[PDB]
Amino acid sequence: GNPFEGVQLWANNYYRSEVHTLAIPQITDPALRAAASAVAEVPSFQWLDRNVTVDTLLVQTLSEIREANQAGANPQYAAQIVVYDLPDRDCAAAASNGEWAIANNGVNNYKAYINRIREILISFSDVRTILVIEPDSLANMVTNMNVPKCSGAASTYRELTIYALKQLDLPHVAMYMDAGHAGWLGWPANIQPAAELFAKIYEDAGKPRAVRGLATNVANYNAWSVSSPPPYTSPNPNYDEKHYIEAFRPLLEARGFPAQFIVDQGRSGKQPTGQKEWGHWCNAIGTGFGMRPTANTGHQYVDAFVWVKPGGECDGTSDTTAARYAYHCGLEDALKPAPEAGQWFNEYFIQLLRNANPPF
Ligand SMILES: CO[C@H]1O[C@H](CO)[C@@H](S[C@@H]2O[C@H](CO)[C@@H](S[C@@H]3O[C@H](CO)[C@@H](S[C@@H]4O[C@H](CO)[C@@H](S[C@@H]5O[C@H](CO)[C@@H](O)[C@H](O)[C@H]5O)[C@H](O)[C@H]4O)[C@H](O)[C@H]3O)[C@H](O)[C@H]2O)[C@H](O)[C@H]1O
Ligand SMILES: *[C@@H]1O[C@H](CO)[C@@H](O)[C@H](O)[C@H]1NC(C)=O
Numbered sequence: 265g266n267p268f269e270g271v272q273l274w275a276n277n278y279y280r281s282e283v284h285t286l287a288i289p290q291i292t293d294p295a296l297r298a299a300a301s302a303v304a305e306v307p308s309f310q311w312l313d314r315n316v317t318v319d320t321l322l323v324q325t326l327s328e329i330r331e332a333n334q335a336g337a338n339p340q341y342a343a344q345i346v347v348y349d350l351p352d353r354d355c356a357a358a359a360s361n362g363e364w365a366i367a368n369n370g371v372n373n374y375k376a377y378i379n380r381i382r383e384i385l386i387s388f389s390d391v392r393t394i395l396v397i398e399p400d401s402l403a404n405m406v407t408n409m410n411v412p413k414c415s416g417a418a419s420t421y422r423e424l425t426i427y428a429l430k431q432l433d434l435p436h437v438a439m440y441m442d443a444g445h446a447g448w449l450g451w452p453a454n455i456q457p458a459a460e461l462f463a464k465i466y467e468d469a470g471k472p473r474a475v476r477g478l479a480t481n482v483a484n485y486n487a488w489s490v491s492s493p494p495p496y497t498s499p500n501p502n503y504d505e506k507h508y509i510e511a512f513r514p515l516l517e518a519r520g521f522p523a524q525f526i527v528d529q530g531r532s533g534k535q536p537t538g539q540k541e542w543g544h545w546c547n548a549i550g551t552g553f554g555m556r557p558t559a560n561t562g563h564q565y566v567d568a569f570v571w572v573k574p575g576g577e578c579d580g581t582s583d584t585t586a587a588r589y590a591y592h593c594g595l596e597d598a599l600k601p602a603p604e605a606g607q608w609f610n611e612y613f614i615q616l617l618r619n620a621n622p623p624f
């Protein structure tokens with residue numbers, strides 16, 4: 265019952281046109297240009313990380329897929345969407361672009377957001393829809409509760425996650441909850457508390473049919489499988505996503521949640537990366553496009569390799585005067601100068617293209 269089996273993944277026209285209009289005209293290497301045209305067709309997730317995206321991007325994407333499917337696509341296309349707008353978002357981060365706050369009607373705002381997404385998904389029940397639920401949320405409950413904002417947000421994160429899981433439990437949907445990455449939850453000491461947390465949420469949500477499992481490495485750079493531990497991973501024995509997932513799944517399953525995984529590989533092709541520390545997430549140097557999206561993972565715990573963060577779209581500005589500036593985006597191992605989050609960062613795209621593995 266793998267939701268990635270038996271469908272094509274939609275490659276959206278926003279990314280395609282960023283590559284064709286902004287990137288390709290700047291490439292002076294004939295080989296790099298050809299590879300860019302290929303990357304434009306690789307299907308990546310689209311992000312509902314601001315409320316305004318619900319009645320715009322989500323509707324537009326689902327309408328375009330419906331049209332392609334009604335025109336005879338074989339196999340049918342599926343949508344890939346990230347739900348990312350919890351109140352007090354990113355609780356352990358020094359800076360966040362989240363728009364809502366628990367202290368300022370954020371619970372109600374979030375429930376309304378989920379309710380509206382549900383309405384739209386019900387109207388597009390002919391489009392198989394794969395969701396990643398809330399990057400950078402519950403993984404903080406495992407390791408970052410010492411941060412006062414995380415201790416304060418934890419009960420709300422749990423309650424609103426349960427809400428989302430129940431509300432978005434629709435027959436044509438598959439959901440994967442974010443579960444960090446090997447350098448977050450994969451440390452041996454964190455695996456059991458993570459398993460307890462996620463399995464209990466699954467149980468408390470009533471084990472909804474649509475909850476397929478967990479998503480890892482979202483918008484991060486870890487290898488699926490590398491033969492040598494990158495230096496910034498030491499001394500974690502679970503230094504890639506395969507190690508993490510193989511240690512984590514049995515603990516989850518023993519607690520009633522036989523979670524299947526999807527693994528972001530969109531910026532994982534070059535290993536080791538140029539990260540100086542594993543927690544350096546923003547516009548990291550020394551990275552490349554990784555394994556293309558596929559259901560044919562070879563691994564029974566992994567439904568798919570995916571591209572959740574679309575490589576080339578900026579993670580955050582390096583403009584330190586900007587209100588939304590995050591200090592991680594100004595580190596030595598972040599590519600600079602970088603535009604606002606989500607804006608096209610052509611120099612980053614070209615880095616990823618040059619470093620792609622497998623090559624395009
Ligand atoms: C053992 O645990 C201890 O050590 C650990 C390190 O070994 C760390 S792990 C560490 O934790 C922290 C949190 O505590 C995070 S920081 C964090 O990381 C995220 C991953 O990149 C990002 S998500 C980010 O979000 C943006 C908004 O959506 C987007 S821009 C967005 O892009 C889309 C698509 O292009 C576009 O459509 C939109 O228009 C744009 O807005 C961006 O690309 C993303 O990167 C998040 O912001 C951030 O807070 C680390 O990742 C992690 O390694 C433990 O914490 C510690 O206890
Ligand atoms: C979120 O967007 C919806 C439309 O999709 C709008 O009705 C609602 O007011 C917005 N929420 C907030 C808190 O502004």
Ligand SMILES: [Mg+2]
Nearest residue numbers: 506507510563
């Ligand atoms: Mg093996």
